[PDB]
Amino acid sequence: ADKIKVSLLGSTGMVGQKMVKMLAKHPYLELVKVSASPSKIGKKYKDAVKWIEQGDIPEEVQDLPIVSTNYEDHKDVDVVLSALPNELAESIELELVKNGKIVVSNASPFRMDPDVPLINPEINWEHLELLKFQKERKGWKGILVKNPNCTAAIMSMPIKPLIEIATKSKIIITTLQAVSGAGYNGISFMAIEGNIIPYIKGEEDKIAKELTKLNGKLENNQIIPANLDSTVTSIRVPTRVGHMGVINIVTNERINIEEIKKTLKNFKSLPQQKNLPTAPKQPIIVRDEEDRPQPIIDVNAESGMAVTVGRIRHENNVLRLVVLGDNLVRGAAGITILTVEVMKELGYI
Amino acid sequence: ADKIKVSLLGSTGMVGQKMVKMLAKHPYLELVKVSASPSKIGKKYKDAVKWIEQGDIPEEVQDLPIVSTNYEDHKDVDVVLSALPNELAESIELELVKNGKIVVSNASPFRMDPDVPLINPEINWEHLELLKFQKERKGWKGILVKNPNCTAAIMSMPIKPLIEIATKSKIIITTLQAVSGAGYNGISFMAIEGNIIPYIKGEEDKIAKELTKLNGKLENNQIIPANLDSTVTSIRVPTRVGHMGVINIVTNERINIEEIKKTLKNFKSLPQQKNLPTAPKQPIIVRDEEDRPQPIIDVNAESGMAVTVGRIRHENNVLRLVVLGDNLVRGAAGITILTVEVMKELGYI
Amino acid sequence: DKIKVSLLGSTGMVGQKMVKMLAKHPYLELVKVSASPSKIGKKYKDAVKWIEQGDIPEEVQDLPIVSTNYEDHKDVDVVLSALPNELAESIELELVKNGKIVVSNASPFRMDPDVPLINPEINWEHLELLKFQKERKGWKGILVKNPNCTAAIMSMPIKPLIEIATKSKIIITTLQAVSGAGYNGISFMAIEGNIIPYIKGEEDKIAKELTKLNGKLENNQIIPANLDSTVTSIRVPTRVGHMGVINIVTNERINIEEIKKTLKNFKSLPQQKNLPTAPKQPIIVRDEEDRPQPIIDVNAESGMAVTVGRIRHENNVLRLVVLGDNLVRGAAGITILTVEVMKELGYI
Amino acid sequence: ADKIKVSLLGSTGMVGQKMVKMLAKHPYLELVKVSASPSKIGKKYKDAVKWIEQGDIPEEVQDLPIVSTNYEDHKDVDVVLSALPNELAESIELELVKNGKIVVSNASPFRMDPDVPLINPEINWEHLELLKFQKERKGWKGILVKNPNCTAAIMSMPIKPLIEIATKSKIIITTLQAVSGAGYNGISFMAIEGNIIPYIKGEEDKIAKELTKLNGKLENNQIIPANLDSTVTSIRVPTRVGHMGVINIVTNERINIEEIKKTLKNFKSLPQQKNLPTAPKQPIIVRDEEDRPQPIIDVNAESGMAVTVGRIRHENNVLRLVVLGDNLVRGAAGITILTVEVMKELGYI
């Protein structure tokens, strides 16, 4: 196939290593440049990274030289992918886009910018149309696309196909997030093992707001935010990978429990239709067993691109369900790569 | 300092060992007999228990011989306390009550029986008055008093002083329950470490139903169930001790956070007033830091009898707060003993 | 040339491991699976609490559970056993007394003089004992044994160093994963954030079994290796992977680099004949001072290779840390490798 | 009680919070000043520390203002206690000592200095005599005493009473150390949970060498190192508090197994003889059960000041025993305080 040359910002972290691994064997996406901190620039990827993924560093990437995050080092790249930390992404990504680079990033800055698409492939690929007016609106020579917070990404999967119910209700959400969500070394053993921390800075606000844009509707070259009144409580649990979410759609709207299970299990979108390399066959898996989903059993579903839903139940004035997803793949690495695949498929390239 | 002689059924399990450790040093409750499995009867406590509590076995209980769960072995005790497993409690307990014994137990059978008080001291001590007509209603010679499910007991604490708002709203509760909740060896290491099991057999139904009785109002010898419409999701987490609850009261009622915090921090009842030995000075502790409560920090609050609440917040049509309590003490051992103390105080002796 | 086999104790962790491995084997065809009495007659998928990775191989999910009695294993070429130590003796003896070829990783008969205790790369030659077993035991069938999972792991590095390990005292400390006691053997409360410096009978099995594993086959029988070792076994909050600290007391000069070289270049029959379950390099050596580590190395070569690191020699003591997959190298894998070796040498 | 005013360097780390906790309630040791990093100086302890100990900050220390580590801020203390990290200790301590202060540190610098006593109270309080000549030998106006590596402190407990045998043999030791040994946030959850790291930078060398000095003999005002041929391997395990150790004494010497057990459990020294406040009545506890010692069961033995020994066995050419101690108390906080107690008792003040 005709290869599309890509570079990767923040390739040293957990999300970065996941992407490096997924790209090392990609059909047409050819990773030719990886970036990391300044002091590592010039060294080979294998000499700068502390491999945390499964197995050895791919040979196709181990010798890739570390380049800076500056425009000059990415001139020959077709698309720049970014996994930079939230506190460094704004300046870096802004300068690149100003210089004409096409940037697809999963870092938080700009995610809620009205002219920037926040993409989760299956959920709102149509929102990419915003790209048609971005250059003129921001006065950029480049292109910027964003991916949502990992938890938001996971939570949006079951909500979208049920957007009509969720829109007319009070959404209560409790999220149980794995330690890896804070990076590989973000949380100490002493602080979390055999424990629970009912607080994750800024996570609750990002979830509620981003969910509003992910489920929004495109009208007249703009995104009309979906009306979602959600209250969320994000908790950190002693889990390595996998974000769980207990969703309670408090509403008196009629609800056909079986039709809902059917709708979720049959949910397919453009990524599934065009059979994109990183698109899972069934983005949403429904489990009938009452003790599912569970991180150690379902986290890897379809390479971590599929979310698993269980305990779907309808009680008085409320539809409840439990969803699980790989925060590293579905929540970051995989959706960024899947976003690029979609863009190529739609001609934004 | 007159000693009231008591016996303990199911003294070998975690709840049992806790009560043994608590009774060993009680000011007036004298543990004189303990029961365990049949093959253990006749052996001294120390030779039949796999002690998992802190430090050595109390020297005032170690040599206590194990007796049977039959009437003849308890004719000489003032009160029969029981921490028997749910599946064996009904038949055993009923006979002791049918033969005239006063039985106070934390096992599930009879909890929702209209003529049996389901007590959590600070919450509904007044319900003990149901006993005035129990004998004639049941045709028993004895008296039976019950303590609720450990989780319900913990959840009911903050809900009581906020019963006015809880009655006029949809209550959504998600609970994170420690492994100890399933006994010392109920859950294997492989099944839970680094994992989450979004289900606990029968737990959710119990929580919802019992909260109704615990917050009910004793009116003319009958308990009027509190109108508490709640949907609960119980989850097992890799925690040793301490059940956490995320409570969302979705209503249109006015929500004053500073007022609610005052109400919760100043909550007190008969146990506190009378300074009963197992009563915490402050039954509800409120935390202002955003990362509280946490099991490893707060589960021991006031010897495990006080619950800890934090993250009290007000969002559109919803009051949210996080509560944590020691499931072995506040949730079982401590409330059974405290119940006996109240009974002594009110004259039921 | 297909070889039809059955599996006793196919429902436990080792059993499920073997099921996954056999489901896709070149010539070994799993035709029957056995489990406890109450499970007999049920389809495997309905009797087992699948705990392995992926789904249950479709060639096994619908296999109906059969008993452990001879009559149900008549049409089988070789009977593989992953039975628990407490039930194996009676069950296996009867099968063998009926003319069945039985290869098991259970402990009973491991130290029986006429029964080979095999760990492929270490002592495949010991399989010769089989040429005399029938008359020596008065059996119609055949019986082969695989060692204790920890012994199996500790033996890998000791073999190529047998000359020095022989003339010296050996001190061994082992840290064994929770799975070594099955999936539900140890509770969360008992081990999380903890260490239990004791595993019933483990230390005696390792010392004695290492003796036979490293023995010399002389004049139709095994000469136990003179391995004077004191071992202390400890249980740790790990899922899979048994670790070992091995100290051999030398009274000479040792070249660490040649030790590393000797270990990584270790090869044997299983490698020579490229058998399906034999790892290309049974012993992997790590130069980084913080290896091996269970989460990083436990899966080395599908779990058939052990990893050694921290190879040091000072104060007349050769010290090394080794790690092995207690479920594959420790059992499932070597039991299958053993059968492969048997087919390779003509015992079939 | 005759008061002794002290200050504590590194009051903020785990070991420091432990000491703060132990000194608040001390009979005659008055913690009058606490120190920490420069950016914390001038703030109240409660506002500068990330409290991680059980319960609340002692109110006798919560309002103490953080001072510097320089001499000017300690001119008024009788003794300066130090729990500073190994990498900063040397310069800071040397300067205090050079200015005439008496410093007792559990940090590694100067531990193996021949003119400086390395103390573990029971094992070698006698070595304190080195102080009578320390000024003449170092030129210092002050006084410096050191405490050993925590693992070495624990390991030296059982080796001392058995020094005659240990000296005529080859000692093989494998230590399994708790995560807290590397500080509260030294190791990440991802790196250690469900894992084992067979390496701890420089631990093995420290144990072997320090073991040599701890067990030495005082002769002609100096220390004759004990001839201890040790070969230690140190491993990191996923436990919170408590270092375990497998000690193998390879010797052909005749050994009476019951005499060893008798010798260990009966070990007592000056700290015990003088009934010092932080001295445990029984420095070494021996267990008969085959599955002991265990971190979660024994680490707290006598407020963490007593080590627990178990599995004592003599197979043939090897004396094997397993030992466990609290790395934070016996291994650091408790011995530093105990050391000061010994000094006061012997007239060093």
XYZ file of N, CA and C in Angstrom, chain A residues 179-290:
336
model
N -4.473 2.583 37.732
C -3.298 3.374 38.059
C -2.571 3.879 36.808
N -2.454 3.027 35.793
C -1.752 3.402 34.568
C -2.285 4.696 33.983
N -3.550 4.999 34.262
C -4.155 6.222 33.757
C -3.367 7.460 34.149
N -2.529 7.332 35.173
C -1.723 8.445 35.645
C -0.293 8.274 35.160
N -0.121 7.428 34.153
C 1.211 7.168 33.639
C 1.779 5.947 34.341
N 3.015 5.579 34.025
C 3.622 4.410 34.642
C 4.117 4.664 36.059
N 4.550 5.890 36.330
C 5.082 6.222 37.649
C 4.312 7.304 38.377
N 3.145 7.665 37.860
C 2.373 8.702 38.507
C 1.960 8.397 39.939
N 1.595 7.149 40.214
C 1.131 6.776 41.551
C 2.028 5.776 42.272
N 2.372 6.087 43.518
C 3.239 5.209 44.300
C 2.494 3.995 44.842
N 3.245 2.937 45.105
C 2.689 1.705 45.643
C 2.042 1.934 47.013
N 2.734 2.689 47.854
C 2.271 3.000 49.199
C 0.945 3.760 49.215
N 0.743 4.620 48.222
C -0.460 5.437 48.152
C -1.730 4.740 47.697
N -1.605 3.749 46.821
C -2.798 3.103 46.296
C -3.059 1.626 46.619
N -2.016 0.830 46.813
C -2.232 -0.588 47.076
C -3.140 -0.864 48.280
N -4.101 -1.755 48.058
C -5.057 -2.106 49.087
C -5.834 -0.874 49.506
N -5.938 0.103 48.609
C -6.625 1.342 48.946
C -7.473 1.922 47.811
N -8.107 3.050 48.095
C -8.937 3.734 47.118
C -8.874 5.234 47.369
N -8.705 5.998 46.298
C -8.621 7.456 46.365
C -9.770 7.979 45.512
N -10.853 8.452 46.163
C -12.051 8.974 45.498
C -11.883 10.300 44.770
N -10.660 10.608 44.367
C -10.415 11.858 43.681
C -9.293 11.807 42.647
N -9.586 12.335 41.466
C -8.616 12.421 40.386
C -8.793 13.823 39.811
N -7.863 14.704 40.162
C -7.854 16.100 39.726
C -8.316 16.368 38.290
N -9.331 17.223 38.161
C -9.851 17.611 36.860
C -10.524 16.570 35.991
N -10.520 15.318 36.429
C -11.121 14.238 35.653
C -12.630 14.349 35.499
N -13.321 14.706 36.574
C -14.777 14.793 36.537
C -15.322 15.877 35.611
N -14.684 17.039 35.605
C -15.116 18.127 34.752
C -14.845 17.804 33.278
N -13.682 17.214 32.997
C -13.326 16.836 31.628
C -14.289 15.792 31.068
N -14.703 14.853 31.914
C -15.614 13.809 31.473
C -16.952 14.394 31.058
N -17.580 15.129 31.969
C -18.879 15.738 31.704
C -18.879 16.656 30.481
N -17.939 17.587 30.420
C -17.882 18.507 29.291
C -17.576 17.821 27.965
N -16.510 17.025 27.935
C -16.123 16.331 26.709
C -17.216 15.411 26.191
N -17.947 14.785 27.102
C -19.034 13.895 26.707
C -20.088 14.714 25.935
N -20.211 15.991 26.297
C -21.154 16.906 25.652
C -20.794 17.164 24.181
N -19.498 17.247 23.894
C -19.038 17.483 22.532
C -18.999 16.194 21.713
N -18.576 15.099 22.336
C -18.509 13.813 21.645
C -19.875 13.372 21.137
N -20.914 13.676 21.911
C -22.272 13.295 21.549
C -23.028 14.410 20.851
N -22.319 15.488 20.531
C -22.938 16.620 19.872
C -23.297 16.340 18.433
N -23.999 17.286 17.820
C -24.432 17.146 16.440
C -23.855 18.257 15.582
N -23.416 17.898 14.382
C -22.851 18.859 13.443
C -23.972 19.528 12.663
N -24.023 20.858 12.707
C -25.051 21.619 11.997
C -24.500 22.972 11.577
N -24.520 23.248 10.278
C -24.014 24.516 9.762
C -22.550 24.736 10.112
N -21.712 23.768 9.766
C -20.284 23.892 10.004
C -19.887 24.058 11.465
N -20.757 23.663 12.384
C -20.420 23.760 13.802
C -21.046 22.617 14.591
N -20.539 22.407 15.795
C -21.041 21.345 16.641
C -22.008 21.839 17.698
N -23.237 21.342 17.642
C -24.230 21.695 18.640
C -24.057 20.697 19.780
N -23.572 21.166 20.936
C -23.349 20.319 22.113
C -24.594 19.558 22.532
N -24.450 18.264 22.801
C -25.597 17.471 23.233
C -25.971 17.915 24.640
N -27.261 17.898 24.949
C -27.708 18.301 26.274
C -27.555 17.144 27.256
N -26.428 17.107 27.957
C -26.188 16.045 28.922
C -25.892 16.617 30.300
N -26.824 16.413 31.221
C -26.649 16.894 32.574
C -26.053 15.746 33.379
N -24.731 15.639 33.357
C -24.084 14.563 34.082
C -23.246 14.981 35.280
N -23.323 14.177 36.336
C -22.554 14.404 37.554
C -21.672 13.159 37.702
N -20.364 13.360 37.752
C -19.474 12.216 37.839
C -18.515 12.225 39.006
N -18.225 11.027 39.496
C -17.310 10.826 40.608
C -16.230 9.863 40.118
N -15.005 10.365 39.989
C -13.896 9.545 39.503
C -13.009 9.054 40.638
N -12.864 7.735 40.711
C -12.095 7.099 41.760
C -10.915 6.299 41.227
N -9.798 6.362 41.943
C -8.606 5.622 41.563
C -8.578 4.322 42.355
N -8.412 3.206 41.646
C -8.357 1.883 42.266
C -7.004 1.227 41.927
N -6.549 0.254 42.751
C -5.277 -0.458 42.558
C -5.328 -1.486 41.424
N -5.570 -0.974 40.228
C -5.683 -1.755 39.009
C -4.604 -1.238 38.060
N -4.053 -2.103 37.217
C -3.018 -1.652 36.295
C -3.619 -0.986 35.073
N -4.470 -1.713 34.368
C -5.068 -1.177 33.159
C -6.551 -1.439 33.089
N -7.293 -0.447 32.601
C -8.729 -0.599 32.467
C -9.516 0.356 33.337
N -10.375 1.148 32.698
C -11.230 2.105 33.387
C -12.656 1.575 33.391
N -13.226 1.455 34.580
C -14.584 0.977 34.707
C -15.492 2.171 34.991
N -16.737 2.081 34.538
C -17.676 3.158 34.768
C -19.074 2.644 35.043
N -19.667 3.114 36.137
C -21.028 2.735 36.482
C -21.876 3.912 36.030
N -22.692 3.675 35.010
C -23.537 4.708 34.452
C -24.997 4.533 34.854
N -25.578 5.599 35.397
C -26.979 5.585 35.800
C -27.733 6.696 35.087
N -28.557 6.321 34.118
C -29.337 7.310 33.400
C -30.677 7.446 34.128
N -30.756 8.442 35.013
C -31.966 8.701 35.807
C -33.016 9.403 34.960
N -34.049 8.662 34.576
C -35.104 9.209 33.734
C -36.380 8.377 33.806
N -37.512 8.992 33.478
C -38.786 8.285 33.494
C -39.210 7.893 32.080
N -38.326 8.115 31.115
C -38.615 7.747 29.731
C -38.806 6.236 29.690
N -39.684 5.762 28.816
C -39.910 4.327 28.702
C -38.594 3.709 28.244
N -38.359 2.460 28.627
C -37.125 1.795 28.254
C -37.302 0.304 28.007
N -36.962 -0.125 26.794
C -37.040 -1.531 26.405
C -35.648 -2.115 26.648
N -35.473 -2.744 27.803
C -34.185 -3.311 28.171
C -33.537 -4.195 27.099
N -34.309 -5.107 26.511
C -33.781 -6.005 25.496
C -33.381 -5.287 24.210
N -34.140 -4.270 23.820
C -33.803 -3.534 22.607
C -32.473 -2.811 22.824
N -32.266 -2.321 24.044
C -31.033 -1.628 24.398
C -29.830 -2.571 24.265
N -29.948 -3.773 24.819
C -28.863 -4.742 24.727
C -28.581 -5.020 23.253
N -29.651 -5.147 22.477
C -29.525 -5.406 21.053
C -28.832 -4.245 20.334
N -29.252 -3.021 20.642
C -28.683 -1.834 20.012
C -27.181 -1.703 20.269
N -26.762 -1.983 21.498
C -25.351 -1.889 21.865
C -24.491 -2.968 21.210
N -24.989 -4.202 21.178
C -24.234 -5.305 20.592
C -24.150 -5.203 19.074
N -25.124 -4.530 18.476
C -25.159 -4.357 17.030
C -24.595 -3.014 16.592
N -24.082 -2.229 17.533
C -23.541 -0.924 17.172
C -22.292 -1.002 16.312
N -22.403 -0.484 15.093
C -21.294 -0.431 14.147
C -21.329 0.945 13.504
N -20.179 1.422 13.051
C -20.116 2.734 12.433
C -19.213 2.680 11.204
N -18.813 3.849 10.710
C -17.959 3.953 9.530
C -16.660 3.159 9.644
N -15.990 3.220 10.810
C -14.737 2.474 10.979
C -14.924 0.970 10.743
N -16.079 0.440 11.139
C -16.370 -0.982 10.950
C -16.753 -1.266 9.498
N -17.452 -0.320 8.887
C -17.903 -0.467 7.515
C -16.761 -0.443 6.508
N -15.786 0.429 6.733
C -14.651 0.531 5.827
C -13.541 -0.418 6.254
N -13.819 -1.211 7.285
C -12.849 -2.168 7.798
C -11.477 -1.543 7.980
N -11.415 -0.469 8.757
C -10.148 0.200 8.997
C -9.298 -0.695 9.904
N -7.992 -0.804 9.606
C -7.035 -1.625 10.360
C -7.110 -1.601 11.881
N -7.404 -0.442 12.458
C -7.472 -0.330 13.909
C -8.896 -0.372 14.483
N -9.890 -0.536 13.613
C -11.283 -0.603 14.050
C -11.686 -2.020 14.463
N -12.222 -2.188 15.680
C -12.630 -3.530 16.118
C -13.901 -3.942 15.371
N -14.149 -5.245 15.246
C -15.347 -5.723 14.554
C -16.628 -5.321 15.293
N -16.587 -5.359 16.624
C -17.738 -4.979 17.446
C -17.221 -4.044 18.539
N -17.318 -2.720 18.321
C -16.845 -1.723 19.290
C -17.442 -1.840 20.684
N -18.610 -2.461 20.777
C -19.262 -2.643 22.061
C -19.645 -4.105 22.243
N -19.183 -4.700 23.335
C -19.494 -6.090 23.642
C -20.426 -6.118 24.848
N -21.503 -6.891 24.753
C -22.443 -7.006 25.865
C -22.293 -8.376 26.527
N -22.148 -8.367 27.845
C -21.999 -9.594 28.609
C -23.277 -9.904 29.383
N -23.736 -11.152 29.311
C -24.945 -11.551 30.018
C -24.665 -11.960 31.463
N -23.460 -12.457 31.732
C -23.128 -12.873 33.088
C -23.091 -11.679 34.042
N -23.795 -11.817 35.158
C -23.902 -10.762 36.154
C -22.601 -10.267 36.792
